[PDB]
């Protein structure tokens, strides 16, 4: 019987690590890419914000929880809902966030306690603390005030999680570091989260428009501040090259809507970079989407045929693109894990970039 | 090695028949439903009209033909393109049809000879004669003039097909009966087609807004006019109940865009009739789309989850609906074939209607 939560590091190269997270519902190989569930993967993401508006968290619980609902019996991660509320809905206070639903007009409050309860009703295995994703750019004073509130909210998240026996005994709770791009605030945030104690630690407040150079600069000093012996989750990242560089800086877990978003808009990821399959240059191209990809799409169909389907507005085309993209991301993570395990990740990263950007 | 074309009838009940068409690329079990290829099935449909505008028939041939292009090595049926040109594009003459492409503005002529050549370039296994689908309603004089032109065009289609060695030796040619709703014209058309000689015979000019009662009335006298020992193809039909009644009247082959169209617009076919899965009554319904369906969707997911996906605009939802609908149609045809073979099709049709319309 697997434990509630156990992270083991099997191999290291520089700051990069590869290992496993064992949970009751399955093993997660790291570094891990965690795709959206409604799009192989060891863990998927549920969409807390959407689910709390349609059908409602109580309704999901009545239907048996998200695992039963989605037909997925392996681990599920849910975000805490505030990023999305603050992105797509609002009134903020020390208690939480108030907002109105575009779907039906109803009012909703979200607080650390309510966020944890919603994630409990959904039945997720990895629960995110309820935080404030500081806007970018932020002044030192605004970044500090926001980070300090998020740390108070992290303690409230911890207490709410621990009060629910079924959750505390079967799920895991991750804290989220904030502090914008400022080293001293990232340090204060890390210290506060470690004093509370979490099962894993996310780097929040990035992939919010700062650009890769700045993101990598912040990762350079921020990830070493987190406990080495716990997983590190970079929220919202990212492009294949962002993932490779973030792994080089000690990140273990990733989520991003790009594979699914790109697959709906004609973009395929390949080892030679992204391509827009609708472009006329693919109309007679008999090669598969990627010449090395092991996925079922590249086993059977050409760029020319997928180009044809998408240009025709056929749903099959978008589904084949999405399947390919999700598969590409999992192949990227497998190559990352194997190369770290084999002590050749530095060479892999160099080879990856030379070809991806050629 | 299979023959170019051989139709055998294994069992009969009333006017209904069940059997097989053997072609070089595979066996087709009849009665057969023939789904759109870009949506198990023994034969799929290519979209001649679309393919001749994008990428062009010559380009498909350069890419290896439709079998290679689509990744489908079993039989393919193509329509002759005139119905669509006359539906979606025009100037008509004894030579053919002239029309302009909305895609690029270019001009196109379609004639019996060009239609046959396009279908040759596409590489289809069952080729339709180039006909005029008479509009509905039609006067006796207009229906006769149109039918007479279609019969002259049927002879020109036969001659063009026979002139192409690779086509005459490896593909099959179907003639299309016209004559609107008029018994004497349907008889003249049947006689003309039988004198020319075809591998199979389609009933054209129906499913054009006449309604099921009138369609069945025309089938009642029209299908017996065709050679009994050759397949009978009802073009454009149809709803599950249209198919059952048409089989009762001697039809062997069907095509219809409803399974795919419905699956894109929230409608699922079930043994208890069609349902609109977006309706709120399905939001907490844990049953599969259909309680008896053997398809992979109904094996794994609920109405509530598919409702959720479609309401969320997720591509996965439309794909699961379409998979279910195509599978439902093939299960319907399997039950039709088995019941005719077992001498209980009359009972099946009665039981089907009592439940489908309950
Ligand atoms: C895109 N870059 C990016 N995403 C971030 C997120 C998650 C945003 C969630 O909403 C959607 O965006 C994503 O799809 C689902 C599956 C719904 O989950 C993701 C963050 N979440 C929290 N709690 N805190 C953060 O500081 C934070 C920062 C982010 N930067
Ligand atoms: C809907 N009812 C209906 N369809 C008919 C068709 C085929 C129309 C083709 O175009 C699309 O419609 C269909 O999807 C593809 C795969 C493109 O093929 C089908 C017909 N075709 C010919 N040649 N002659 C006819 O008398 C005729 C009558 C019809 N009645
Ligand atoms: Zn692939
Ligand atoms: Zn089904």
XYZ file of C-alpha atoms and ligand atoms in Angstrom:
778
model
C 0.000 0.000 0.000
C 1.458 3.336 -1.065
C 1.834 6.167 1.465
C -0.231 9.329 1.448
C 2.836 11.203 0.183
C 6.514 10.296 -0.293
C 9.016 12.082 -2.544
C 12.274 10.286 -3.346
C 15.121 11.616 -5.502
C 16.763 8.859 -7.532
C 19.389 10.887 -9.405
C 20.756 14.422 -9.688
C 22.774 16.443 -12.207
C 23.658 19.990 -11.241
C 20.456 21.446 -9.775
C 18.294 19.014 -11.782
C 16.634 16.043 -10.057
C 14.653 12.975 -11.141
C 12.610 10.731 -8.865
C 9.088 9.753 -7.838
C 6.187 10.985 -5.745
C 4.226 8.070 -4.296
C 0.587 8.727 -3.384
C -2.303 6.409 -2.585
C -3.699 6.629 -6.134
C -0.399 6.238 -8.002
C 3.236 7.070 -8.628
C 4.252 10.364 -10.280
C 7.577 10.346 -12.147
C 9.482 13.632 -11.896
C 10.195 15.887 -13.633
C 6.479 15.662 -14.479
C 4.222 17.430 -16.944
C 0.641 17.582 -15.663
C -1.880 18.107 -18.485
C -5.391 19.460 -18.206
C -7.686 16.543 -17.492
C -10.294 17.422 -20.095
C -7.732 17.473 -22.933
C 1.490 8.921 -20.563
C 0.628 11.369 -17.797
C 0.819 10.252 -14.157
C -1.360 13.110 -12.826
C -3.820 15.524 -14.408
C -5.194 18.942 -13.489
C -8.753 19.735 -12.565
C -10.103 23.221 -13.195
C -11.243 24.386 -9.768
C -12.585 27.740 -10.922
C -14.679 26.283 -13.723
C -15.943 23.374 -11.626
C -17.082 25.652 -8.807
C -19.331 27.491 -11.306
C -20.421 24.492 -13.412
C -21.793 22.152 -11.950
C -20.628 23.334 -8.543
C -18.321 21.596 -6.088
C -21.217 20.195 -4.045
C -22.682 18.720 -7.237
C -19.347 17.124 -8.192
C -19.232 15.576 -4.723
C -22.809 14.305 -5.129
C -21.719 12.660 -8.410
C -18.903 10.858 -6.593
C -15.986 13.291 -6.869
C -13.796 14.273 -9.780
C -12.098 10.863 -10.176
C -15.430 9.101 -10.795
C -16.802 12.072 -12.764
C -13.883 12.219 -15.212
C -13.187 8.466 -15.237
C -9.624 8.960 -13.994
C -8.501 6.900 -10.960
C -4.953 8.250 -10.709
C -3.783 11.446 -8.950
C -5.435 14.798 -9.656
C -4.041 18.252 -8.798
C -6.379 21.240 -8.317
C -5.390 24.901 -8.122
C -6.881 27.017 -5.358
C -9.044 29.168 -7.661
C -7.846 32.671 -6.815
C -5.534 33.175 -9.802
C -8.455 32.377 -12.082
C -11.024 34.440 -10.156
C -8.592 37.360 -10.336
C -8.035 36.645 -14.051
C -11.486 35.846 -15.459
C -14.179 37.147 -13.056
C -14.085 41.268 -7.805
C -13.394 42.572 -4.286
C -10.362 41.611 -2.198
C -10.012 41.706 1.587
C -8.066 39.911 4.305
C -10.958 37.399 4.415
C -10.762 36.420 0.736
C -12.133 37.392 -2.683
C -15.728 38.271 -3.605
C -16.809 37.979 -7.258
C -19.815 37.553 -9.559
C -20.300 34.626 -11.946
C -20.588 35.513 -15.621
C -22.368 32.159 -16.078
C -25.431 32.931 -13.931
C -24.829 36.247 -12.105
C -24.665 34.641 -8.653
C -22.237 35.898 -6.023
C -19.306 33.870 -4.719
C -16.761 34.367 -1.941
C -13.476 32.497 -2.028
C -11.297 32.305 1.083
C -8.549 29.935 2.194
C -11.122 27.874 4.066
C -13.647 27.765 1.207
C -10.946 26.986 -1.362
C -9.745 24.035 0.689
C -13.335 22.839 1.155
C -14.026 23.082 -2.581
C -10.889 21.072 -3.319
C -11.993 18.535 -0.691
C -15.427 18.215 -2.333
C -13.719 17.715 -5.706
C -11.603 14.971 -4.147
C -8.239 16.023 -5.516
C -5.014 14.367 -4.359
C -2.752 17.440 -4.497
C -4.349 20.568 -3.045
C -2.925 24.056 -3.553
C -2.914 26.655 -0.821
C -5.069 29.709 -1.501
C -2.748 32.519 -2.583
C -2.677 35.882 -4.320
C -0.791 35.793 -7.665
C 0.864 39.207 -7.536
C 0.474 41.177 -10.793
C 3.543 41.910 -12.859
C 5.251 44.316 -12.673
C 4.925 45.084 -8.957
C 6.682 47.599 -6.749
C 8.660 46.253 -3.787
C 5.986 47.540 -1.374
C 3.043 46.030 -3.251
C 4.890 42.751 -3.806
C 5.686 42.544 -0.079
C 2.143 43.352 1.093
C 0.755 40.767 -1.316
C 3.300 38.110 -0.326
C 2.607 38.736 3.378
C -1.126 38.229 2.872
C -0.457 35.077 0.883
C 1.616 33.742 3.782
C -1.177 34.432 6.278
C -3.484 32.697 3.821
C -1.022 29.765 3.591
C -1.350 29.195 7.333
C -5.133 29.385 7.081
C -4.982 26.884 4.190
C -2.844 24.506 6.270
C -5.268 24.694 9.203
C -8.363 24.130 7.052
C -6.740 21.158 5.302
C -5.682 19.591 8.617
C -9.198 19.968 10.061
C -10.701 17.598 7.399
C -9.700 14.057 8.394
C -10.319 12.493 4.981
C -8.242 15.207 3.337
C -5.375 15.263 5.834
C -5.026 11.462 5.722
C -5.351 10.897 1.934
C -4.351 14.103 0.090
C -1.288 16.380 0.094
C -1.019 20.168 0.442
C 1.423 22.404 -1.465
C 2.399 25.927 -0.363
C 3.015 28.651 -2.966
C 5.982 31.023 -2.794
C 5.352 34.620 -3.851
C 7.438 37.811 -3.762
C 7.418 38.856 -7.436
C 10.990 39.230 -8.794
C 12.574 40.316 -5.473
C 15.127 38.042 -3.819
C 14.536 39.238 -0.231
C 10.764 38.719 -0.527
C 11.189 35.294 -2.141
C 13.391 34.390 0.841
C 10.878 35.646 3.401
C 8.146 33.706 1.595
C 10.181 30.498 1.508
C 10.971 30.838 5.224
C 7.306 31.378 6.083
C 6.183 28.370 4.061
C 8.856 26.096 5.548
C 7.903 27.164 9.077
C 4.286 26.158 8.406
C 5.320 22.952 6.644
C 3.903 21.609 3.339
C 4.219 18.411 1.327
C 5.536 20.330 -1.671
C 6.394 23.886 -2.661
C 5.294 25.784 -5.739
C 7.017 28.801 -7.250
C 4.105 31.155 -7.843
C 3.862 34.553 -9.461
C 5.804 33.753 -12.649
C 4.730 33.121 -16.248
C 2.753 36.371 -15.911
C 4.438 38.269 -18.733
C 7.989 38.708 -17.439
C 9.784 36.822 -20.202
C 12.131 33.855 -20.031
C 15.335 35.700 -19.093
C 13.690 37.302 -16.045
C 11.873 34.086 -15.106
C 15.153 32.146 -15.169
C 16.882 34.894 -13.157
C 14.207 34.634 -10.443
C 14.335 30.818 -10.490
C 18.131 30.988 -10.084
C 17.865 32.336 -6.524
C 14.300 31.257 -5.649
C 14.349 27.481 -6.037
C 17.357 26.918 -3.686
C 15.361 28.677 -0.948
C 12.788 25.875 -0.901
C 13.373 22.628 1.018
C 15.591 20.445 -1.153
C 13.830 17.219 -0.077
C 10.362 18.223 -1.301
C 8.975 18.620 -4.818
C 9.194 21.994 -6.564
C 6.252 22.982 -8.803
C 6.579 25.885 -11.290
C 3.005 27.022 -11.913
C 1.982 27.928 -15.462
C 5.180 26.886 -17.293
C 5.419 26.459 -20.157
C 7.011 26.228 -23.588
C 9.302 23.205 -24.091
C 12.400 25.395 -23.752
C 11.018 26.974 -20.547
C 10.587 23.485 -19.094
C 14.130 22.391 -19.974
C 15.645 25.511 -18.415
C 13.439 25.290 -15.338
C 14.471 21.663 -14.788
C 18.091 22.872 -15.022
C 17.180 25.152 -12.100
C 15.638 22.476 -9.852
C 11.931 22.342 -10.850
C 10.158 18.963 -10.612
C 6.547 19.649 -11.777
C 4.913 21.683 -14.561
C 1.474 22.611 -15.910
C 0.585 24.676 -18.982
C -2.402 25.134 -21.280
C -0.151 25.475 -24.354
C -0.350 21.856 -25.636
C -4.151 21.953 -25.705
C -4.450 25.627 -26.691
C -1.935 25.216 -29.528
C -3.632 22.018 -30.702
C -6.905 23.910 -31.083
C -5.251 26.709 -33.103
C -3.118 24.821 -35.615
C 0.223 24.731 -33.778
C 2.155 21.475 -33.317
C 5.239 21.035 -31.154
C 8.143 19.163 -32.750
C 11.789 18.531 -31.877
C 12.563 21.103 -34.646
C 10.364 23.724 -32.997
C 6.686 24.618 -33.310
C 4.996 24.546 -36.719
C 1.659 26.009 -37.884
C 0.130 23.086 -39.728
C -2.427 25.295 -41.530
C 0.381 26.935 -43.518
C 0.312 26.028 -47.212
C 3.854 24.612 -47.023
C 2.395 21.509 -45.331
C -0.306 20.780 -47.925
C 1.858 18.194 -49.736
C 4.187 17.221 -46.851
C 3.984 13.442 -46.404
C 6.128 13.355 -43.250
C 4.415 12.814 -39.870
C 4.028 15.831 -37.580
C 7.373 14.926 -36.035
C 9.801 12.480 -37.641
C 10.751 10.865 -34.307
C 7.477 11.016 -32.368
C 6.228 7.644 -31.153
C 2.616 8.838 -30.858
C -0.252 7.166 -32.678
C -0.837 10.236 -34.874
C 2.710 10.244 -36.224
C 2.505 6.482 -36.658
C -0.455 6.736 -39.039
C -1.035 10.192 -40.544
C 0.805 12.858 -42.541
C 1.204 16.587 -42.085
C -0.677 16.930 -45.378
C -3.724 15.083 -44.065
C -3.804 16.894 -40.707
C -3.407 20.187 -42.611
C -6.383 19.179 -44.766
C -8.580 18.310 -41.778
C -7.869 21.520 -39.885
C -8.351 23.664 -42.991
C -11.679 21.899 -43.527
C -12.834 22.647 -39.968
C -13.008 18.946 -39.095
C -12.983 18.173 -35.373
C -10.769 15.153 -36.069
C -7.946 17.511 -37.025
C -7.910 19.393 -33.739
C -8.095 16.128 -31.798
C -5.111 14.648 -33.658
C -3.108 17.844 -33.117
C -3.933 17.805 -29.396
C -3.075 14.131 -29.028
C 0.249 14.753 -30.730
C 1.060 17.785 -28.573
C 0.246 16.079 -25.253
C 2.289 13.073 -26.371
C 5.196 15.304 -27.394
C 5.241 16.875 -23.929
C 5.299 13.465 -22.256
C 8.130 12.342 -24.550
C 10.045 15.493 -23.626
C 9.614 14.705 -19.941
C 10.670 11.072 -20.439
C 13.835 12.211 -22.230
C 14.520 14.673 -19.406
C 14.072 11.964 -16.749
C 16.224 9.431 -18.591
C 19.000 11.933 -19.298
C 19.201 13.078 -15.655
C 19.174 9.455 -14.520
C 21.981 8.683 -16.991
C 24.077 11.731 -16.118
C 23.757 13.319 -19.570
C 21.079 15.964 -19.008
C 23.491 18.854 -19.593
C 24.242 17.441 -23.035
C 20.549 16.786 -23.702
C 19.624 20.401 -22.910
C 22.319 21.699 -25.258
C 21.298 19.297 -28.036
C 17.618 20.087 -27.483
C 18.134 23.839 -27.868
C 20.419 23.577 -30.896
C 17.744 21.625 -32.760
C 14.581 23.265 -31.392
C 15.840 26.745 -32.349
C 17.713 25.819 -35.571
C -7.667 -12.957 -54.027
C -11.009 -11.166 -53.924
C -12.778 -10.206 -57.165
C -13.177 -6.662 -58.407
C -16.862 -6.854 -57.458
C -19.178 -9.654 -56.286
C -22.490 -9.237 -54.449
C -23.962 -12.300 -52.735
C -27.242 -12.453 -50.799
C -27.012 -14.789 -47.814
C -30.527 -14.399 -46.395
C -33.832 -12.660 -47.101
C -36.950 -11.686 -45.144
C -39.744 -10.036 -47.085
C -38.023 -7.463 -49.307
C -35.069 -7.186 -46.897
C -31.722 -8.804 -47.760
C -28.400 -9.386 -45.991
C -25.150 -10.424 -47.651
C -21.706 -9.235 -48.718
C -20.002 -7.212 -51.421
C -16.492 -8.511 -52.079
C -13.998 -6.053 -53.576
C -10.225 -6.137 -53.924
C -9.708 -3.966 -50.824
C -12.221 -5.717 -48.554
C -15.613 -7.209 -47.805
C -18.658 -4.982 -47.188
C -21.424 -6.485 -45.036
C -24.924 -5.432 -46.102
C -27.093 -3.723 -45.108
C -24.193 -1.278 -44.679
C -23.858 2.184 -43.195
C -21.048 4.130 -44.870
C -19.771 6.991 -42.684
C -17.888 10.065 -43.794
C -14.206 9.210 -43.800
C -13.059 12.306 -41.943
C -15.397 11.643 -38.990
C -16.839 -0.972 -37.387
C -17.387 0.418 -40.873
C -16.404 -1.662 -43.913
C -16.366 1.306 -46.337
C -16.176 5.070 -45.916
C -17.157 8.061 -48.037
C -14.809 10.563 -49.580
C -16.035 14.084 -50.265
C -15.485 14.527 -53.993
C -16.695 18.117 -54.143
C -14.500 19.298 -51.290
C -11.453 17.357 -52.477
C -11.676 18.784 -55.991
C -11.395 22.302 -54.497
C -8.921 21.535 -51.685
C -6.224 20.269 -52.470
C -7.461 19.282 -55.913
C -7.854 15.814 -57.391
C -4.506 15.984 -59.203
C -2.829 16.882 -55.903
C -4.505 13.962 -54.101
C -3.213 11.680 -56.851
C 0.289 13.155 -56.483
C 0.098 12.357 -52.744
C -0.723 8.728 -53.541
C -4.527 8.710 -53.718
C -7.171 8.964 -51.040
C -6.382 5.607 -49.374
C -2.786 6.649 -48.619
C -3.828 10.248 -47.884
C -6.455 9.305 -45.286
C -4.636 6.214 -43.977
C -7.541 3.928 -44.884
C -6.753 0.789 -46.941
C -10.300 -0.562 -47.192
C -13.000 0.405 -49.732
C -13.918 4.045 -50.339
C -17.058 5.343 -52.089
C -17.080 8.776 -53.774
C -20.116 10.688 -55.016
C -19.972 12.238 -58.468
C -19.931 15.861 -57.249
C -22.954 17.320 -59.026
C -25.400 17.184 -56.108
C -22.921 19.184 -54.053
C -22.014 21.642 -56.828
C -25.740 22.243 -57.308
C -26.157 22.578 -53.522
C -23.166 24.630 -52.349
C -21.629 26.473 -55.343
C -23.671 27.651 -61.588
C -24.605 27.013 -65.232
C -26.089 23.758 -66.529
C -25.972 22.392 -70.076
C -26.020 19.025 -71.825
C -22.205 19.025 -71.463
C -22.175 19.388 -67.668
C -22.134 22.035 -64.928
C -20.029 25.211 -64.768
C -19.445 26.855 -61.369
C -17.136 29.179 -59.424
C -15.206 28.174 -56.299
C -15.975 30.162 -53.163
C -12.554 29.049 -51.868
C -10.429 30.831 -54.495
C -12.759 32.219 -57.203
C -11.470 29.870 -59.913
C -13.817 28.392 -62.501
C -14.644 24.695 -62.731
C -16.586 22.558 -65.201
C -17.950 19.198 -64.132
C -19.138 16.695 -66.738
C -19.633 12.933 -66.698
C -16.138 12.487 -68.099
C -14.465 14.912 -65.675
C -16.356 13.488 -62.692
C -15.185 9.983 -63.532
C -11.616 11.240 -64.009
C -11.678 13.045 -60.658
C -12.916 9.887 -58.950
C -10.163 7.938 -60.736
C -7.515 10.395 -59.495
C -8.912 10.049 -55.963
C -8.633 6.275 -56.298
C -12.042 5.347 -54.953
C -13.347 1.776 -55.130
C -17.033 2.579 -55.718
C -17.598 5.335 -58.275
C -20.943 7.076 -58.748
C -22.262 8.035 -62.149
C -22.603 11.772 -62.743
C -26.280 12.654 -62.353
C -28.652 15.550 -61.791
C -30.441 15.376 -58.397
C -33.843 16.716 -59.418
C -35.164 19.402 -57.035
C -38.229 18.657 -54.966
C -41.032 19.230 -55.711
C -40.825 18.787 -59.489
C -43.496 18.759 -62.164
C -43.823 15.613 -64.282
C -42.291 17.431 -67.278
C -39.299 18.810 -65.377
C -38.726 15.503 -63.585
C -38.769 13.661 -66.928
C -36.413 16.084 -68.706
C -34.006 15.895 -65.777
C -34.178 12.095 -65.555
C -33.601 11.786 -69.318
C -30.471 13.934 -69.121
C -29.240 11.917 -66.161
C -29.655 8.739 -68.213
C -27.646 10.181 -71.109
C -25.071 11.188 -68.515
C -25.150 7.637 -67.069
C -24.099 6.238 -70.441
C -21.339 8.830 -70.711
C -20.224 7.889 -67.174
C -20.131 4.194 -68.114
C -18.038 4.908 -71.217
C -15.557 7.141 -69.380
C -15.145 4.577 -66.590
C -14.584 1.738 -69.078
C -11.946 3.750 -70.971
C -9.615 3.868 -67.886
C -8.045 0.409 -67.567
C -6.988 0.784 -63.931
C -10.484 1.931 -63.012
C -12.430 -0.631 -65.039
C -10.324 -3.509 -63.673
C -10.167 -2.490 -59.970
C -13.167 -0.254 -59.147
C -16.952 -0.564 -59.521
C -19.497 1.840 -61.031
C -23.004 2.504 -59.668
C -25.838 4.035 -61.718
C -28.329 6.414 -60.074
C -32.081 6.178 -60.646
C -33.980 9.463 -60.881
C -37.578 10.387 -61.742
C -38.652 12.318 -58.627
C -41.795 10.776 -57.050
C -43.303 9.485 -60.332
C -43.645 5.740 -60.856
C -43.518 5.808 -64.681
C -40.325 7.904 -64.682
C -38.691 5.727 -62.016
C -39.466 2.746 -64.269
C -38.021 4.394 -67.374
C -34.913 5.313 -65.376
C -34.474 1.788 -64.026
C -34.857 0.342 -67.534
C -32.276 2.750 -68.946
C -29.762 1.971 -66.214
C -30.214 -1.796 -66.567
C -29.736 -1.572 -70.338
C -26.401 0.202 -69.812
C -25.391 -2.156 -67.005
C -23.846 -1.158 -63.635
C -22.319 -2.979 -60.682
C -24.890 -1.484 -58.325
C -27.900 0.816 -58.434
C -28.609 3.840 -56.279
C -32.007 5.381 -55.624
C -31.315 9.069 -56.165
C -33.453 12.150 -55.763
C -34.820 11.386 -52.281
C -34.021 12.767 -48.822
C -34.502 16.204 -50.415
C -37.323 17.397 -48.173
C -40.177 15.063 -49.111
C -40.699 13.485 -45.698
C -40.621 9.853 -44.631
C -44.134 8.847 -45.726
C -43.515 10.039 -49.298
C -39.987 8.598 -49.363
C -41.300 5.184 -48.295
C -44.118 5.401 -50.864
C -41.577 6.025 -53.646
C -39.285 3.255 -52.363
C -42.263 0.861 -52.352
C -42.485 0.842 -56.161
C -38.963 2.035 -57.057
C -36.674 -0.548 -55.476
C -38.358 -3.590 -57.150
C -37.604 -1.968 -60.523
C -33.860 -2.354 -59.972
C -32.045 -5.639 -60.665
C -32.636 -7.883 -57.663
C -29.128 -9.409 -57.847
C -27.235 -6.127 -57.428
C -26.832 -3.846 -54.413
C -29.325 -1.032 -53.829
C -27.947 2.234 -52.388
C -30.314 4.885 -50.944
C -28.354 8.136 -51.143
C -28.554 10.559 -48.220
C -30.575 8.399 -45.788
C -30.828 8.865 -42.931
C -32.312 8.801 -39.444
C -32.235 5.381 -37.733
C -35.954 4.879 -38.388
C -35.504 5.839 -42.069
C -32.810 3.169 -42.367
C -34.952 0.450 -40.771
C -37.893 1.211 -43.059
C -35.695 1.453 -46.140
C -34.145 -1.943 -45.371
C -37.717 -3.284 -45.112
C -38.105 -2.033 -48.698
C -34.973 -3.683 -50.134
C -32.154 -1.129 -49.590
C -28.641 -2.488 -48.939
C -26.430 0.640 -48.489
C -26.779 4.001 -46.718
C -24.877 7.252 -46.153
C -25.851 10.260 -44.033
C -24.112 13.198 -42.372
C -26.420 13.011 -39.327
C -24.146 10.982 -36.985
C -21.291 13.459 -37.400
C -23.484 16.568 -37.687
C -25.495 15.607 -34.592
C -22.320 14.782 -32.663
C -21.035 18.302 -33.298
C -24.303 19.895 -32.102
C -25.055 18.023 -28.885
C -27.351 15.272 -30.188
C -26.739 11.601 -29.349
C -28.580 8.659 -30.878
C -29.825 6.020 -28.435
C -32.130 3.002 -28.623
C -34.667 5.228 -26.755
C -34.428 7.939 -29.404
C -32.197 10.982 -29.829
C -31.254 13.086 -26.802
C -29.742 16.592 -26.570
C -26.948 16.072 -24.079
C -26.581 19.822 -23.396
C -30.006 19.859 -21.723
C -29.818 20.444 -17.968
C -31.631 17.155 -17.275
C -28.361 15.329 -18.041
C -26.131 17.340 -15.687
C -26.385 14.728 -12.901
C -27.225 11.650 -15.026
C -24.643 8.955 -14.258
C -25.866 6.535 -16.941
C -23.810 6.144 -20.146
C -25.137 7.791 -23.312
C -26.959 4.553 -24.079
C -27.480 1.809 -21.499
C -26.804 -1.002 -24.003
C -24.151 0.539 -26.259
C -20.930 -1.457 -26.466
C -18.867 1.564 -27.553
C -15.825 2.763 -25.644
C -17.562 6.012 -24.634
C -20.454 4.223 -22.950
C -17.985 1.824 -21.359
C -16.149 4.626 -19.552
C -18.050 7.923 -19.315
C -21.375 9.299 -18.076
C -23.971 11.545 -19.654
C -23.128 14.027 -16.890
C -19.469 14.209 -17.891
C -20.148 14.467 -21.637
C -22.746 17.162 -20.857
C -20.079 19.008 -18.859
C -17.491 18.814 -21.648
C -19.831 20.036 -24.372
C -21.173 22.855 -22.198
C -17.567 23.866 -21.520
C -16.729 23.980 -25.241
C -14.168 21.185 -24.895
C -13.263 19.427 -28.142
C -13.151 16.119 -26.258
C -16.916 16.324 -25.783
C -17.739 16.582 -29.471
C -15.317 13.760 -30.270
C -16.902 11.434 -27.695
C -20.386 12.268 -28.993
C -19.289 11.565 -32.575
C -17.597 8.304 -31.641
C -20.746 7.203 -29.849
C -23.019 8.151 -32.754
C -20.931 6.389 -35.423
C -20.746 3.333 -33.166
C -24.504 3.417 -32.578
C -25.116 3.391 -36.333
C -22.822 0.400 -36.804
C -24.565 -1.438 -33.955
C -27.909 -0.703 -35.608
C -26.647 -2.173 -38.870
C -25.237 -5.252 -37.112
C -28.598 -5.858 -35.420
C -30.338 -5.449 -38.784
C -27.979 -7.940 -40.465
C -28.261 -10.497 -37.668
C -32.051 -10.239 -37.478
C -32.495 -10.722 -41.246
C -30.065 -13.638 -41.154
C -32.031 -15.156 -38.253
C -35.454 -14.592 -39.804
C -36.612 -12.157 -37.106
C -36.147 -8.780 -38.799
C -39.886 -8.058 -38.892
C -39.983 -8.428 -35.115
C -36.809 -6.359 -34.713
C -38.275 -3.469 -36.726
C -41.439 -3.488 -34.618
C -39.473 -3.659 -31.357
C -37.073 -0.964 -32.564
C -39.872 1.494 -33.345
C -41.822 0.845 -30.146
C -38.758 1.739 -28.084
C -37.193 4.449 -30.268
C -40.460 6.433 -30.337
C -41.700 5.633 -26.790
C 0.004 30.769 -17.033
N 0.960 31.135 -15.978
C 0.603 30.988 -14.672
N -0.377 30.232 -14.286
C -0.402 30.377 -12.904
C -1.265 29.811 -11.949
C -2.352 28.800 -12.321
C -3.511 29.249 -13.197
C -4.535 28.084 -13.332
O -5.573 28.562 -14.199
C -5.237 28.326 -15.577
O -4.387 29.445 -15.982
C -4.365 27.054 -15.556
O -5.132 25.873 -15.975
C -5.725 25.252 -14.840
C -5.744 23.734 -15.010
C -7.148 25.772 -14.637
O -4.885 25.644 -13.754
C -4.055 26.810 -14.073
C -1.048 30.162 -10.607
N -1.884 29.633 -9.599
C -1.684 29.997 -8.373
N -2.477 29.512 -7.401
N -0.723 30.884 -7.969
C 0.134 31.439 -8.861
O 1.001 32.215 -8.432
C -0.017 31.081 -10.249
C 0.832 31.652 -11.202
C 0.607 31.274 -12.513
N 1.242 31.646 -13.679
C -29.001 14.319 -47.888
N -29.843 13.640 -48.883
C -29.322 13.341 -50.106
N -28.047 13.297 -50.342
C -27.956 12.972 -51.690
C -26.824 12.806 -52.507
C -25.397 12.891 -51.962
C -24.891 14.218 -51.420
C -23.388 14.079 -51.040
O -22.991 15.348 -50.500
C -23.265 15.412 -49.090
O -24.669 15.801 -48.968
C -23.134 13.955 -48.600
O -21.851 13.734 -47.917
C -20.871 13.302 -48.854
C -19.923 12.293 -48.210
C -20.079 14.499 -49.380
O -21.635 12.704 -49.902
C -23.044 13.112 -49.878
C -27.054 12.488 -53.856
N -25.960 12.315 -54.732
C -26.198 12.054 -55.977
N -25.168 11.897 -56.829
N -27.446 11.950 -56.529
C -28.559 12.092 -55.767
O -29.662 11.959 -56.317
C -28.382 12.378 -54.366
C -29.505 12.555 -53.553
C -29.250 12.849 -52.226
N -30.109 13.088 -51.175
Zn 3.280 12.578 -32.770
Zn -21.952 4.411 -26.877
